[PDB]
Symmetry: D2
Subunit: 169 residues, 4 copies
């Protein structure tokens, strides 16, 4: 459990990348007409959601849901609002195996939205057991032990403004 | 809420006998399955029906519950406690009219890939069906009347009635 | 894990006891005037709730909530309806240490109901770490390994019409 | 919803500076505690405020969320994920007017016996207070106007605004 944290992706680099992500997302949904909603997966994506939605120059709603912790994907907390006939962008902190988002996307698809897309801050292509389409990615990283920016290690470092790496001593 | 009266539509004795029959049918279907079985009830209206039905199901199974919402999207207010993957799942509902809600609930549970998936409802109002949903076990197919009792409510009332009654307004 | 189940409290004995419980509860709340509600603690009390509320000859509502699994008592699912200014009777399958009901009663008390009472099917006085007032008890039993009537063993025997004892082989 | 206009009440720069200040105050309070700390946000309106605030809190803490309802009873739609027993708990709210909801939420969390319990709100409308609830950290005390932005909505709108604005109808 003895460890330390070094900066891997500085605060400024994250901010710059999200600014670009915001422009990409804006470019795709600004000429839609239908209502838009960003859905965050609690509670690793709350900080990413906050910064991202501010860089999205399109009128949209902000909703959250909480999925399960091989076991099934259960919904601890569902969305507060409806998504039928809307443009839905799922906002996740990091995707590895892609199990959770795969199931979450299926569940949300049943409610028949106009479109359904996924935006992630971090991506680990190495670990991947279920191929799930991801349209917006902030950073592609190797299978490293990362924390910060909503991402935790034993419920710690969630509040770090940067993405850091954990070094096991 | 308006002035009304509750008249018996399905007496307590008729329900007990019918659930006993339903029990034998469900038992005969999943007795040679071998795989784990679970009865899933949809709160709140199905709590009484579930209690009596599972006591008539003579196979080793599990009892779980979930709460769904409502043209609105069917949202999960309370999910299952256990996994249904590779298990015989029997959804237990109090009454079907539109079939919108139950259709969606079956779709969600199907995503978790159970061995088999089926529905058992106590009451059925086929004259209100808007979506074709396959129901395998039906206690009573009833006429288009607002029923109460046996878990079913009217303004959160009459859930504790041991029989199925119908609400008749005073006009 | 190898075991077997013998009948401890037969179906008829439970039914007779609940009939008496129903009369007691009816006698206390029939001259109240205020609305009444039976609150069941999922999912061990669903069968007891079904039989009990049918023996209560007073107009009441039926609601359910799901508490936590030393850790804190968390609410996985809250009540659907309000209890403010109402007569509330908490319905539990079995009470031992009395930790959960103690916390649940505190939480419900904050919503300021007219009265707040607890009805349990089984009671284990031996195991008890928090003294919580219980007005209606179906059976007082020694610290035995019991199942059935909503009470489970590894998610099993919940559907038994009788209270049985587990014999570890 | 009616025809309206959104005018800036608290610019983005003013919020960033104020949250920075709030951060230093919170840091100085719990730095010598030693016991674990957790910031509890009340969804949904507080997600943005939480994200910026916890980044300014220079002590090792945890971030958790909960969702409460609403004269109705305050019900828990989504409870905390972690335990708060023996921990410094700081509730993080977007705005206080009546104070009914937050009063009840504090009561529920107090039952779990944390080491300490405190409240930090971004906005405050003391001219709407109906219940005396002790708030220790306040970003802005604002006049009686319907504000939007920074997590706060109007018919599920304007949550994504980086500033605090006010809705003005067209009459
Ligand atoms: O380096 C990592 N550091 C901390 N977490 C990681 C890392 N790598 C993958 N995770 C877990 C990220 N997963 C999110 C769950 C977070 C664990 P929880 O909060 O206890 O439920 C995504 C799995 P998915 O692809 O099926 O959606
Ligand atoms: O006579 C009736 N009496 C009380 N309800 C009825 C009746 N008839 C149809 N309902 C509504 C029952 N529907 C469930 C909603 C329950 C009301 P809730 O307490 O707000 O959850 C059936 C869903 P379905 O679309 O799958 O058929
Ligand atoms: O012989 C027993 N047989 C099966 N259970 C027992 C027995 N004895 C005490 N329990 C557990 C009963 N407890 C209810 C929780 C059931 C376990 P869960 O469904 O996994 O959450 C009451 C503890 P409380 O007094 O704090 O309310
Ligand atoms: O200008 C305002 N703009 C949007 N809301 C306001 C404003 N002013 C007071 N509210 C309502 C905010 N209240 C929380 C309810 C949030 C609405 P929900 O999305 O249905 O949960 C404060 C609870 P309190 O009683 O502790 O002060
Ligand atoms: Mg995540
Ligand atoms: Mg129903
Ligand atoms: Mg229990
Ligand atoms: Mg709020």
């Amino acid at each position: 459990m003895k460890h330390t944290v070094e900066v891997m992706i500085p605060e400024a680099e994250i901010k710059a990348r999200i600014a670009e992500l915001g422009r990409q997302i804006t470019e795709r949904y600004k000429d839609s007409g239908s209502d838009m909603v960003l859905v965050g997966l609690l509670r690793g994506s709350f900080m990413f959601m906050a910064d991202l939605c501010r860089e999205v120059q399109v009128s949209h709603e902000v909703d959250f849901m909480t999925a399960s912790s091989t076991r099934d994907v259960k919904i601890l907390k569902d969305l507060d609002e409806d998504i039928r006939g809307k443009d839905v962008l799922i906002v996740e902190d990091i995707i590895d195996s892609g199990n959770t988002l795969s199931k979450v996307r299926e569940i949300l698809s049943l409610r028949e939205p106009k479109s359904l897309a996924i935006c992630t801050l971090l991506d680990k292509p190495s670990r991947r057991e279920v191929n799930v389409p991801v349209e917006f990615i902030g950073f592609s990283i190797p299978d490293e032990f990362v924390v910060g920016y909503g991402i935790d290690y034993a419920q710690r470092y969630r509040h770090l403004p940067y993405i850091g790496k954990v070094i096991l001593l």
